[PDB]
Design a protein around this ligand. Structure first.
Ligand SMILES: *[C@@H](CCOC(=O)CCCCCCCCC)OC(=O)CCCCCCCCC
Ligand SMILES: *[C@H](CCOC(=O)CCCCCCCCC)OC(=O)CCCCCCCCC
Ligand SMILES: CCCCCCCCOCCOCCOCCOCCO
Ligand SMILES: [Ca+2]
Ligand SMILES: [Ca+2]
Ligand SMILES: [Mg+2]
Ligand SMILES: [Mg+2]
Lengths: 941, 479, 145, 9, 99
């Protein structure tokens, strides 16, 4: 251990937990070079993103294998398969872990020496080790009582010059602020109820959206029970977290319960030990998306409307039939109180380890793990038609363009079952010879993973608000699904050693995977790793290590990618489907993904060299690594021309490359006895480059995209995730071509490469003061890089609310370098046609001079990631009390974010498409980010 | 660990998926394109409806400001080729019933005809070969027409007398009706060759010998199949009435003609002005223009005739209206034979069925004995215009794709010489029924739309895709 | 606070409601042609200079549109004599033009920017000098005509 | 990819 | 004509007891008191779904029918709380009494 020949980072429980985050990975967001960590949103308590040395797999498995006490953990994600209309994320598998139960976390960043763990390790390993039994002075009880608040952070920057209206002209029913300039004048607004209409001063409500949000509240309770003997150790823990975030009502909720029992017993050569854990969660999400969702309704509010005034439903003007606008949006408070989107989960995981030392130098370890989960989701929406359409302005008075057509209600329930089994049988041989040392490990590993669900859906509810499968007069919808994959591999690992300073390691493994063709299921991968401590020098150099490694890691495909299938005939049409059966007849179609029985395995090959040194009395340290990864032949469903009879073919890709530098530098410029002061800086720079995608299929394939809109791709010579977007035409001198009649930009025929998803570099900056029992930590997270799509900016441009749209005071304008394109050869002429007041709305909604690509936003940000103020009480105070330790602790997270001036819209730490590669397409009006801060009380007994 | 578990348990065993289980997906797939997405944009190009003043979904289809990257037919291209045509390929591999092979070749040929009437060129000879050819070349629309008509000739020649053995949702195993569909498709395509001046000599006598045999179909060739349920409605109703809000309002050239001829059909699928009780069509592409001129509050939804979605949910998808059959037959008698009565009798028949398909059976004499009475048609050109304008009316809310194609072939309705801005200032300038170039018009060369862009999915993955041309480049049969 | 921005002549562009008086026989005649209130636009040039903007009557009076000089600091605009009209082959001369912010009063009684200028048309066979004066169009249907 | 819809105003 | 159904049941009970015991001998007597609290929560739910008239005769899958599927959903929940006491009296391991 720490004779390792590739990059890795150890973090200790206290740093993991001092932030009091509900989650074991969030607090490490910008603190480990090479390890990119992000939250999908600030909605409690959604998934988290952990990608190590860039995206190797497209698509879309790039999470690191989590290993707890020797056993692979399930890190499945539950997020919505349609982030356009119903965004929600219910959690990450790693989020079940109880912080406060972690004793050390070690992230193995390299994929050269991954025989001990399987092919899943190519994405990095997060090697978790839980607290065990220890003798202390008390009874062995640690209690943590937490409490925190979450207020909104970064709401879009709004224009406050123009109120409700369109085309420049005042309106009474708009969802936008393209109306006249604000004056004191008293104007009507809204709909008419009982021959009456509301009259309000036409003024701006600058804090109307800010005042809509609440302060989220979360209380946490953690208990641990601990003790040991010379033959035995026993740890038992419980954690409870309850969060209700800043969106009003309880629709943004997270309950978390964990229970754990860990014990070991030694008796002779024999040690037996077991770890068993139960994990519960309930989630409620304020769905996001382009439809009747809370936030999409919230942003399409004119700047003069008091949003906190739309809540009281006894004011009939706030009813869904008289709500002040009928334009694809309804009252946000009605959505939060009458829609359902719940998820509940039960999880059991654990292991049994049997250790038996024999013949002086041997150890037999048998370790089996089981991980099983049952999750149920229930979501519904009212029959808005039946309740409100008839005889109301927003319903019948808007005819077929009503927000209630055909919103007839639906309810669905899904129960999902997940079960993973791993078995390891190892013999370890460990013997010194002279100055040398030999340690060899041989073993067999066996893996079984299974997932199943049952889904049922009703539409057109009879009682309009009741969510139940009996509540429908129409045919219901069922779906069922399961996947089973199995793996067996055998592996050897030889660690050799000379003196205390020269370490060689040699791994190998060979796996048999069910997900590869029958006649090619076997794939072998070896590695080599060196470590040389060049500390052999007569105090100025505390430590001095040089590393090198070269190794491979194989990988298999996902389930069922080999044979042709026939699916139940359906057809996808824009915004709907036509599915069989009809009418009384069932039917099947040829599956549009072409399987391949000539696949080969995947093979990631990595080279890496590194350098670690420490100076003075450990007052200055640095670690630096240079890596070069190629994930080759990964099995992928590659895009194909539908005229071939299929829309994709499964085949082995070319290489995806990731090379770069990971750098950590820390030092203690002040170390008294009563006082310290540390500083830390870490730096990452990765160079993503898809090297080849099979030529025969064109060399490009979609990761995620909007039909006819902005799309993220993988292209043969470029970094992973390149955006193409809509762009205005230009003449040979670079002037923007505009339409001679409207004055509006004209599309440039083709898209439109406008950046990629990768940060150009990432880095973090941390300090840590310590006086007596006082301690303080301040962390900064800095990533400067690519671009993402932001519907938050899009909808706020379209709606006339973004400050950017108050440009030119909205007086008629000629685009400042316009040109008009003119028998059969082309001619360009200065443009004299202005954009009229009546069309300024459309200039900005389309994206201004940038057009569609306007809504790719600079991913960059600088963020005050976390702050921890710790108060460890003097032991003197506790002599007359049951307490062994009291640590009062005040903290804050995600406190402040600075972006470049081109991003006055979002905190870029957002997505609506999950926690992996597809989530890098961006945010589709995901809920705004939070400012989290609170207190923790720690009482040891 | 047993490792032989990679057979996907969520689908049957491929040896249990037989022709009678696949074939019903062919016609359903075609109908979800030709009756939905394709249909939808064809209804703008043929100027049946426009974009409502208060929504924005089809701005760029009305103002012809879409491009290749707009992917306006990518879904349908996927449906027709990786859905219906691959399934058609699977049925011919699995069954040997000549009656089933005939109904598949017809739906096959029809699907290729829809593609060709869109992008002129289309993958055909090398299509549907999978990894053997992931990048099929796009044959010319004429190679295809001459080929799919060649496939039909052989398939009809292989019939032995046995009957169909497959679930037919179009004709229910009525082999006569499939023969008629093939003949109507030949009549349809034979005319395209003629008006393209390509091998016009022979294809004209073939056109004449078809009508002499009258071996066409009865009723409409439709997919009567849809239920007002989720995932089972009419495709176009699904997309536009359920999936989105109301986006279509009636278009000026369809209302003016329906209003000039005193046609009671103007109430079928069109609603009256919610503020005046009148029928009001929007000038093609003029949504943003009429808002500037008249004012925001004076050109909302209330001020324009909305398209009615009520008759949609269960409405079938049409492959070949009966009205259109006669209007194609009345043209043949008019200008290739020389019956004036047989053309009169086919013309009046077409209008009679169309009056009956809608809720107006027994009111055809309001058009046949008043204004469109044919008696008032002096020149044969005066008659063809009347035929072609009644075809255009009959295809409203039925088969928009065929109206766009038939508009392009016959070049009737005529293009108005007056501009949208002109027709808005004056009103006597406009001959009612003539098309209007879109007020905003993104075609650098002006005029009406003549084809669809190539599917972006084929652009990106098929290096043999022809190069992107502007919407104003015609297909191979329009001149 | 982010700055929205604008064109260099931003504050003097606009939509205006004007009436056209005329100086006849030494006196000023309120709307001699009986034209009522008419709409006109000022706006920036494709060059975006802070010294010249367009003046555009939108074809509602003489059918004229020219580039006028701008003194953007002073909020004035003028020509140095008779300048080409771009709507049809004529010449126009603009004199003593200014944009006076918040000086006007809308039909509903609110402050609006006043625009006023003298104009002459070289194909006016009577050779008069006209005073175009008005207010910045607010957007409410009650301040229209 | 999959589709989005315009707004209203 | 074939039939295939699947049901997933989910059961869950939670029991919590808080107690205090008191045990003290006096002059040959013995006293054992117990005061407690009970809290119970029992929950069952399931999700049923059935299809009839199988398209492919042998395949057992909810997709294998051209007819309407049958769905059913069910859930029960019940709660109980109590307080209890148990007094044990004892004389010289001869007379035992309990209340
Ligand atoms: C599924 C994964 C594939 O399983 C294997 O690797 C083969 C079984 C080897 C494990 C047995 C080792 C026993 C060592 C004393 O795994 C399973 O299906 C689990 C089957 C049940 C095994 C139960 C072992 C009981 C020991 C407490
Ligand atoms: C269902 C039954 C209802 O009764 C209760 O509410 C239990 C309250 C007593 C809590 C006792 C805490 C003892 C502290 C040493 O009960 C439930 O559903 C469970 C609700 C949450 C209980 C969490 C228990 C934490 C134990 C470490
Ligand atoms: O042969 C591989 C052994 O290298 C050690 C090394 C490559 O490092 C690339 C650094 O960017
Ligand atoms: Ca809340
Ligand atoms: Ca300004
Ligand atoms: Mg298919
Ligand atoms: Mg033509």
């Amino acid at each position: 251990e720490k004779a390792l020949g590739y990059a890795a980072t150890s973090v200790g429980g206290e740093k993991i937990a001092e932030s009091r985050t509900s989650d074991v990975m969030s607090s490490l967001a910008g603190k480990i070079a090479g390890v990119q960590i992000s939250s999908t949103s600030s909605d409690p308590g959604a998934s988290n993103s952990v990608i190590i040395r860039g995206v190797s797999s497209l698509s879309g498995t790039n999470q690191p294998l989590y290993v707890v006490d020797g056993v692979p953990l399930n890190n499945s994600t539950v997020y919505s398969t349609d982030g356009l209309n119903s965004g929600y994320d219910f959690g990450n598998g790693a989020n079940a872990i109880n912080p406060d139960d972690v004793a050390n976390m070690t992230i193995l960043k390299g994929a050269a020496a991954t025989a001990l763990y399987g092919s899943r390790a190519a994405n990095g390993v997060v090697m978790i080790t839980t607290k065990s039994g220890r003798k202390e002075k008390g009874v062995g009880i640690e209690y943590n009582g937490g409490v925190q608040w979450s207020t909104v952070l970064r709401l879009p920057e709004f224009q406050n010059e123009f109120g409700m209206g369109w085309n420049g002209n005042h309106t009474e029913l708009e969802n936008g602020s393209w109306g006249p300039r604000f004056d004191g004048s008293m104007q009507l607004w809204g709909n008419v109820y009982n021959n009456s209409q509301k009259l309000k001063p036409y003024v701006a409500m600058p804090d109307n959206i800010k005042d809509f949000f609440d302060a989220g509240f979360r209380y946490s309770n953690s208990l641990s029970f601990n003790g040991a003997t010379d033959k035995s150790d026993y740890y038992v823990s419980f954690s409870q977290i309850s969060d209700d975030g800043m969106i009003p009502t309880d629709a943004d909720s997270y309950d978390k319960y964990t229970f754990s029992a860990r014990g070991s017993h030694k008796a002779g050569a024999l040690t037996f030990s077991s770890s068993l854990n139960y994990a519960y969660q309930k989630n409620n999400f304020a769905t996001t998306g382009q439809g009747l969702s809370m936030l999409n309704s919230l942003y399409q509010t004119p700047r003069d409307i008091s949003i906190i005034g739309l809540e009281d439903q006894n004011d009939p003007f706030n009813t869904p039939g008289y709500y002040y606008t009928p334009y694809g949006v309804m009252n946000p408070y009605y959505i939060l109180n009458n829609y359902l989107n719940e998820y509940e989960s039960e999880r059991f995981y654990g292991k049994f380890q049997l250790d038996y030392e024999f013949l002086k130098y041997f150890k037999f370890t048998y370790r089996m793990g089981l991980d099983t989960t049952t999750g149920q989701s229930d979501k519904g929406k009212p029959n808005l038609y039946a309740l409100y359409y008839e005889g109301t302005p927003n319903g019948e008075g808007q005819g077929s363009s009503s927000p209630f057509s055909g919103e007839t209600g639906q309810y669905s329930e899904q129960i999902t079952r997940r079960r993973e089994i791993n078995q390891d049988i190892m013999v370890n041989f460990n013997m010194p010879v002279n100055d040398f040392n030999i340690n060899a490990l041989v073993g067999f590993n066996g893996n079984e993973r299974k997932v199943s669900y049952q889904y049922s859906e009703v539409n057109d509810l009879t009682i309009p608000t009741w969510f139940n499968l009996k509540n429908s007069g129409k045919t219901p919808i069922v779906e069922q699904h399961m996947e089973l994959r199995r793996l067996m591999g055998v592996f050897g690992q030889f660690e050799g050693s000379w003196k205390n300073m020269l370490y060689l390691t040699v791994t190998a493994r060979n796996d048999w995977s069910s997900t590869l063709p029958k006649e090619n299921r076997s794939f072998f991968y070896p590695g080599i790793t060196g470590s040389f401590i060049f500390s052999e020098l007569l105090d100025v150099i505390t430590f001095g290590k040089i590393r090198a490694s070269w190794g491979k890691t194989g990988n298999d495909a996902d389930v069922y990618m080999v044979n042709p299938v026939y699916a139940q005939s359906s057809n996808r049409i824009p915004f709907g489907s036509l599915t069989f059966p009809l009418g009384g007849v069932n039917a099947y179609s040829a599956g549009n993904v072409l399987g391949s029985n000539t696949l080969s395995p995947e093979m990631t090959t990595e080279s890496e060299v590194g350098l670690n040194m420490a100076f003075f009395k450990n007052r200055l340290s640095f670690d630096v690594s240079y890596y070069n990864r190629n994930t080759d032949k990964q099995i992928f469903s590659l895009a194909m021309d539908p005229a071939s009879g299929y829309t994709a073919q499964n085949m082995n890709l070319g290489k995806i490359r990731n090379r770069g530098i990971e750098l950590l530098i820390s030092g203690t410029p002040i170390r008294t006895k009563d006082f310290s002061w540390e500083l830390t800086w870490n730096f990452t720079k990765n160079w993503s480059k898809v090297i080849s995608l099979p030529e025969e299929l064109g060399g490009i394939t979609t990761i995620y995209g909007l039909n006819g809109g902005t799309s993220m791709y993988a292209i043969t010579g470029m970094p992973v995730g390149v955006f193409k977007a809509q762009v205005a035409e230009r003449d040979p001198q670079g002037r923007i071509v505009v339409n001679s009649s409207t004055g509006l930009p004209v599309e440039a025929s083709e898209f439109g490469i406008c950046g990629d998803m990768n940060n150009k570099y990432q880095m973090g900056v941390s300090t840590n003061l310590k006086y007596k029992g006082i301690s303080l930590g301040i962390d900064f997270d800095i990533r400067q890089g690519g671009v993402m799509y932001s519907r938050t900016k899009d909808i706020n441009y379209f709606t006339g609310n973004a400050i950017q749209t108050a440009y030119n005071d909205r007086n008629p304008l000629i685009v400042p370098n316009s040109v008009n394109k003119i028998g059969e050869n082309v001619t360009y002429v200065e443009n004299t046609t202005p954009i009229t007041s009546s069309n300024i709305y459309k200039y900005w909604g389309d994206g201004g001079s940038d057009m569609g690509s306007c809504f790719l936003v600079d991913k960059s940000y600088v963020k005050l990631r976390s702050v921890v103020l710790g108060w460890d009480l003097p032991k003197r105070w506790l002599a007359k009390t049951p307490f062994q330790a009291v640590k009062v602790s005040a903290y804050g997270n995600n406190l402040f974010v600075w972006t470049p001036s081109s991003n006055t819209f979002i905190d870029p730490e957002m997505t609506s498409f999950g926690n992996d590669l597809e989530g890098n397409y961006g945010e589709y009006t995901a809920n705004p980010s939070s400012r989290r801060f609170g207190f923790n009380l720690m009482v040891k007994f | 660990c047993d490792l032989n578990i990679n057979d996907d348990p969520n689908y049957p065993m491929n040896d249990q998926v037989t022709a009678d289980l696949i074939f019903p997906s062919i016609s359903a797939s075609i109908a979800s394109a030709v009756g939905g997405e394709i249909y939808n944009y064809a209804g703008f190009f043929a100027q049946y409806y426009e974009q409502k003043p208060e929504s924005n979904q089809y701005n760029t289809l009305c103002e012809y400001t879409f491009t290749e990257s707009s992917q306006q037919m990518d879904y349908s291209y996927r449906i027709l080729f990786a859905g219906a045509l691959e399934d058609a390929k699977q049925v011919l591999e699995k069954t040997t019933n000549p009656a089933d092979r005939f109904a598949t070749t017809i739906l096959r040929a029809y699907a290729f005809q829809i593609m060709v009437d869109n992008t002129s060129d289309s993958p055909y000879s090398e299509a549907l070969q999978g990894n053997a050819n992931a990048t099929p070349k796009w044959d010319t629309g004429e190679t295809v027409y001459k080929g799919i008509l060649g496939e039909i000739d052989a398939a009809e020649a292989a019939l032995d007398g046995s009957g169909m053995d497959v679930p037919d949702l179009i004709f229910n195993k009525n082999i006569a009706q499939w023969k008629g569909f093939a003949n109507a498709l030949r009549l349809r395509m034979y005319l395209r060759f003629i008006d393209a001046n390509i091998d016009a000599a022979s294809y004209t006598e073939k056109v004449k010998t078809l009508v002499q045999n009258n071996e066409f179909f009865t009723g409409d060739v439709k997919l009567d199949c849809f239920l007002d349920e989720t995932d089972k409605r009419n495709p176009w109703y699904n997309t536009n009435a359920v999936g989105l809000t109301g986006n279509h309002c009636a278009a000026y050239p369809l209302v003016s003609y329906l209003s000039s001829t005193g046609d009671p059909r103007i109430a079928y699928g069109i609603s009256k002005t919610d503020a005046d009780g009148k029928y009001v069509g929007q000038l093609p592409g003029g949504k943003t223009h009429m808002q500037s001129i008249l004012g925001t509050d004076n050109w909302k939804n209330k001020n324009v005739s909305a398209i009615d979605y009520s008759i949609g949910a269960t409405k079938p998808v049409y492959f070949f209206t009966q009205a259109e059959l006669q209007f194609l037959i009345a043209e043949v008698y008019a200008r290739f034979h020389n019956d004036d009565a047989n053309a009169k009798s086919a013309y009046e028949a077409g209008v009679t069925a169309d009056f009956a398909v809608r809720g107006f059976a027994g009111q055809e004499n309001t058009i046949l004995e008043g204004a469109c009475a044919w008696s008032a048609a002096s020149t044969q050109a005066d008659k063809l215009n009347l035929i072609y304008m009644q075809k255009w009316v009959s295809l409203f809310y039925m088969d928009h794709m065929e109206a766009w194609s038939e508009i392009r072939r016959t070049d009737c309705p005529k293009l108005s010489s007056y501009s949208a801005a002109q027709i808005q200032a004056s009103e006597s300038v406009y001959t009612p029924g003539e098309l209007v170039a879109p007020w905003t018009n993104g075609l650098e060369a002006g005029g009406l739309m003549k084809r669809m862009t190539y599917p972006l999915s084929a652009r990106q993955q098929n290096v043999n895709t022809p190069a992107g041309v502007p919407g104003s480049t015609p297909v191979w049969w329009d001149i | 606070d982010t700055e929205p921005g604008g064109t260099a002549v931003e504050k003097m562009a606009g939509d205006w409601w004007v009436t056209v008086n005329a100086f006849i026989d030494g006196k000023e005649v309120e709307d001699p042609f009986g034209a009522g209130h008419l709409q006109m636009s000022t706006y920036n040039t494709a060059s975006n200079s802070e010294t010249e903007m367009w003046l555009d009557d939108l074809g509602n009076f003489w059918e004229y549109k020219l580039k006028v000089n701008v003194n953007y600091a002073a909020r004035t605009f003028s020509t140095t004599g008779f300048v080409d009209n771009v709507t049809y082959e004529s010449k126009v001369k603009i004199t003593d033009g200014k944009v006076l912010e918040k000086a006007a009063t809308t039909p509903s009684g609110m402050p609006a920017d006043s625009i006023v200028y003298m104009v002459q048309f070289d194909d006016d066979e009577d050779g008069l000098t006209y005073k175009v004066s008005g207010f910045r169009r607010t957007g409410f249907p009650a301040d229209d005509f | 990819g999959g589709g989005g819809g315009g707004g209203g105003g």
